[PDB]
Ligand binder design. Structure first.
Ligand code: NAD
Ligand code: NAD
Ligand code: NAD
Ligand code: NAD
Ligand code: XT0
Ligand code: XT0
Ligand code: XT0
Ligand code: XT0
Lengths: 265, 260, 268, 268
């Protein structure tokens, strides 16, 4: 018996096989889940990547800025999972910020049009996906998004930090809506994992500073350490939330960061 | 000797004489500050309102969505305060959310275009104003914005809650920039005050506000009295919180410290 | 099959079958754990209660104020689980405050001797148990304590609120120590559950404010919780504790998981 | 003219002229306050130190573990300020932890007797002082205690961290009581300041790692603070305490003001 045996779970956000979503999906399939996957923009590349998962899973296109994609999403999921079936889980593992909003670009020089796009994709879309998909979720279901602790400012993360703060607030409102369906909504505040988006943050000249700051903020603080090349602990944590084993947690944030955020130094 | 004697302070956000900014401005003038005021959209109304302040102050137009207003702001402040003078303080007391983003409108039905406008005015603009004005601020200066505690979701406040969360995060980054100028940046998380914006968001509203605030506050909370809020903002503009930045001071009667 | 298949877990704090520890233990056995149980003071009563668990488990005496009990604990656990075996999990589900520290007794009238006893049992003992047991824990293990959100003051909970604040701080230090053994330490901040200790806060189920206690609990929890909250159902709490004892939260330590229906995320 | 013109303020915790309480008292007198001072144990030393304040102030003995001192405190303050006068302000700037509770001494080896003494003096006493003095405080008054941010664990601070967590919780309950008198209760979470407790007590408990201390403090504070942090300058902290004693934070209670250069708002 797998942790997610018989659950139907939608997973967004696979772009490469380092993607946090790829590992969430891998672990969920290892634990008996039937997945629907969504991908943005490079669908043929993404299909090649999702072929490396342990099991087959249909891949549906979703650009969270596209109103038509969102309006048709539930119908397209239903068609993939079979009429009369519903989702037990939804994973939002999606983010974006234009280059002006991150890295060494001065914080004040990001135009609002760029910041707005970032907040749309990174924060608002958590609400939009929940809106689209709650109508096809079973009671006892679980919506999970990915967070990066924005409680304190930090170098480089800049306007994405602002977007994460927004996302945390959105998650608490999504929980209010989701509760009417017997559905939980939570975020996983992950420690740093080496992904495509991670390399986009400085995106350059200061790659060395990024690694140094990450080692100082996370592995050095974490009482159990932190390995940025191992997404499994994060994937497992997301699977815990998708499971029946955190049935009283909603509107909330679970930290999968080796305990770093609990330690000052 | 007033608390803000000899300080030059820009105050945004006066629309009526209930405005939190109106009271911030009144108290700051009572404490010896020389003000510059900024107003949005209803300049003739705002001029009538600012005539009720204890002292005269120049009023400059500022729509925080207008790039040209922001690009000319510092020059227009400098011309009002006299060349070679700088600001000691900046008050951001500004917000907006379209009707779709608040009240009884379902949370999921606010389009992003509306939420975005709200975030632009209510959060991003804190950074915009700091960008425009830090180059004309003295060391030891203070930037203050108004917050409403968004740590927990609540009825009605909806997407404005999201905007306030964004604002809190923006404030922490503004503090990093402002520190290079020897300038502090902080928010005041105020309890509820009867203002124009409040009526934009009424018996259930007042009951919820009384439950969240006065009933929790160990010293009580009076929604018709802006003075405690204005004083708190003046404390932050003063020299008396010189080691506080990137931070949030709660002027809410202690409500947020009490569960029930 | 089970979430805790093959794990050896110590569970403290069973006094009745409403005890949060009793449900933690029940769920853990349903999920394939082998338990060792510890009990305080009323060992014969507790033995009768633990007979109602799904499976047999040895019961060992532990008064967390007793230095000798703590010094012999690991040896007595080892003898119960078999030499060469170690624990995978430890559950601290223990608390105490004298009556002067709770309820309608004025906050300022609790003498420090009483508050101190409360803090000793309710907070310091989390460190004591970890000290005693980490030497017999496997890497990958998990220590879990029970919390009640003390971030804001509230009526009645009074000095126990202070003890919980202390416990949260202790948990973060225990995490630092436990990390050296590859062991996690976390608390579960539970919503309210009707237990013996709950009734002791107002001086009994009959206590003068029992009515106000239930009203405040309904206002603080079920009314705020987006998924509701049932004070008569410990299962969601027990499951949450079992999640932490499992391998499924492997990157969480020094931390607090809220099993409160999401109440703490909502203002009203 | 002064921020605290005409206020009567009690200040505890002066032991040397580096004491945060000494600077709180200095600044308060510069701002027009009439003080009553309390000191512990070394009254002759403390009298010499308080002579270096800008104005004379009566000094009363107070050992916060001594029940008789607490029971007589109000009467002895009243006699110093004149019958029928009340205090506007009370400053708690008092702490203690035995060396076993700090530094390089292992966290698990601190006996509870030592921790308890620490918590008594550093946390419970905030309640005891408020109990003694609220009956002689005017409406609009202010009680202020000193905090060091214990939200996250850290090296060395150990069980004092636990005590500060307890103090924060105590402060929220003191606020509930104080509100009935129209009185505010708040803490100032200060950045690190070179004092006797810092250097001798915390420094001493670090033993052969005493040299680490400045490096750890610079990493936690000045490096994070957007306006920097100077450990040799207590004035920003003193001013912050005076802000809270003033009428200029009239809607803040049960709360914590951070006078740490903004360090706690920045991750790195
Ligand atoms: N990697 C880390 O260190 C880390 C830590 C904490 C949180 N997170 C968050 O985890 C999530 C996944 O990021 P990742 O690190 O795995 O990155 P990744 O680059 O592997 O994935 C980011 C995903 O966002 C998708 N996306 C962007 N714009 C989109 C749009 N308009 N519509 C739909 N999808 C869109 C991309 O298509 C991609 O699949 C993000 O929310 C990220 O902020 C990452
Ligand atoms: N009233 C309360 O209960 C309360 C409590 C906490 C925080 N706040 C915050 O205090 C601030 C002031 O609100 P208020 O209650 O005094 O209401 P108010 O209606 O009196 O003022 C809000 C101000 O926002 C200005 N504004 C809107 N769009 C703008 C734009 N494009 N450019 C510039 N200014 C713009 C309006 O002109 C008005 O002056 C806001 O940040 C609000 O969220 C209010
Ligand atoms: N019931 C709730 O609403 C609730 C909610 C959140 C947290 N908690 C916490 O849950 C834990 C268990 O509480 P409960 O509600 O199950 O209570 P309960 O009354 O069933 O059991 C409390 C236990 O504490 C044990 N204990 C007391 N003094 C002891 C000592 N000296 N040495 C060892 N054990 C000792 C008792 O034997 C008893 O088994 C406590 O930490 C409590 O604070 C309870
Ligand atoms: N120095 C720092 O870096 C720092 C930072 C934040 C908070 N604090 C806090 O500030 C306060 C003042 O400490 P400090 O650093 O000025 O040190 P300090 O040594 O100058 O003062 C500590 C005071 O505690 C008193 N005290 C101890 N036991 C007492 C008792 N039984 N009765 C009464 N008074 C007693 C001492 O007599 C002394 O005056 C404490 O609460 C401390 O935890 C210090
Ligand atoms: N998807 C996405 C995404 C979009 C914009 C920026 C980051 C995004 O994904 C992340 C990728 C990696 C991280 C972890 N992280 C933070 C940093 C910054 C530099 C050191 C501190 C902050 N580096 N890596 C966090 C993320 O949210
Ligand atoms: N300026 C502005 C503004 C724009 C959109 C929404 C609110 C705005 O100002 C406020 C006006 C009033 C309040 C306090 N408040 C919140 C509410 C909601 C009603 C139920 C509780 C929350 N009612 N009054 C907070 C505010 O930020
Ligand atoms: N074990 C134990 C224990 C010892 C002293 C006090 C409480 C104890 O266990 C709890 C029992 C019940 C609760 C939950 N709780 C809170 C309260 C109220 C706070 C609002 C009114 C009383 N009533 N029940 C929390 C607990 O820690
Ligand atoms: N009074 C008092 C007191 C008693 C025992 C221990 C400390 C006391 O006062 C302090 C003295 C100093 C600080 C700041 N501090 C912390 C440290 C630790 C060394 C590594 C960082 C934590 N060093 N200086 C905080 C305090 O409460």
């Amino acid at each position: 018996t797998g942790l997610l045996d018989g659950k139907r779970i939608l997973v967004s956000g696979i772009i490469t096989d380092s993607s946090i979503a790829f590992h969430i999906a891998r672990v969920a399939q290892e634990q008996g889940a039937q997945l629907v996957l969504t991908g943005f923009d490079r669908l043929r590349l993404i299909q090649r990547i999702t072929d490396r998962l342990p099991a087959k899973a249909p891949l549906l296109e979703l650009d969270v800025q596209n109103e038509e994609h969102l309006a048709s999403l539930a119908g397209r999921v239903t068609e993939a999972i079979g009429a009369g079936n519903k989702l037990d889980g939804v994973v939002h593992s999606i983010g974006f910020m234009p280059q002006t909003g991150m890295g060494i670009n001065p914080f004040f020089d990001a135009p609002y049009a760029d910041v707005s796009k970032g907040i749309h994709i990174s924060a608002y879309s958590y609400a939009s996906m929940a809106k689209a998909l709650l109508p096809i979720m079973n009671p006892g279901g679980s919506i999970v998004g990915m967070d990066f602790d924005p409680s304190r400012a930090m170098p480089a993360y800049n306007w994405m930090t602002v977007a994460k703060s927004a996302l945390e607030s959105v998650n608490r409102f999504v929980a209010r809506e989701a509760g009417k369906y017997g559905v939980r909504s939570n975020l996983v505040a992950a420690g740093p994992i080496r992904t495509l988006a991670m390399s986009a943050i400085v995106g350059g000249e200061e790659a060395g500073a990024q690694i140094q700051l990450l080692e100082e903020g996370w592995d050095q603080r974490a009482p159990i350490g932190w390995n940025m090349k191992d997404a499994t602990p994060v994937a497992k944590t997301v699977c815990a939330l998708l499971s029946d084993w955190l049935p009283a947690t909603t509107g909330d944030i679970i930290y999968a960061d080796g305990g770093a955020h609990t330690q000052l130094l």
